[PDB]
Amino acid sequence: ELETARKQQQSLQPVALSWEKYQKQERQLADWLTLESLLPLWFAQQASH
Q1: Distance of alpha carbon 36 from alpha carbon 15, whole angstroms
Q2: What DSSP line would sit under 13-42, residue for residue?
Q3: What is the C-alpha to C-alpha distance for residues 34 and 4, in angstroms, rounded to an integer?
Q4: Coil, strand or helix: which one is 47?
Q5: Distances 19 to 15, 25, 39, 43 between C-alpha atoms, Å
Q6: Half-sphere exposure of 41 (CA within 13 A, CB side)
Q7: Using CA atoms, how far apart are residues 26 and 5, in angstroms rounded to an integer?
Q8: Element holding 4 (H helix, E strand)
Q9: How many CA atoms lie within 13 A of 10 on its CB side?
Q10: Which DSSP state fits 43?
C-alpha cells in the first residue's frame, strides 16, 4: 500500500509541473495580447508629440 501511494505520487508529480508551465505560457500570452491591443495608443501619443 505504501509503495503504491509513493508510485502514485511520483506519477502525479510531472502533471503539476506541466500545469504550472501551461499557466506560465498562458499568462505570458495574455500579457502579450494586452500589448497587442494597446499598441495603437503608444504610437499615437508618440506621433502626436
Answers
A1: 31
A2: HHHHHHHHHHHHHHHHHHHHHHHHHHHHHH
A3: 45
A4: helix
A5: 6, 10, 30, 36
A6: 5
A7: 32
A8: helix 2-48
A9: 6
A10: H
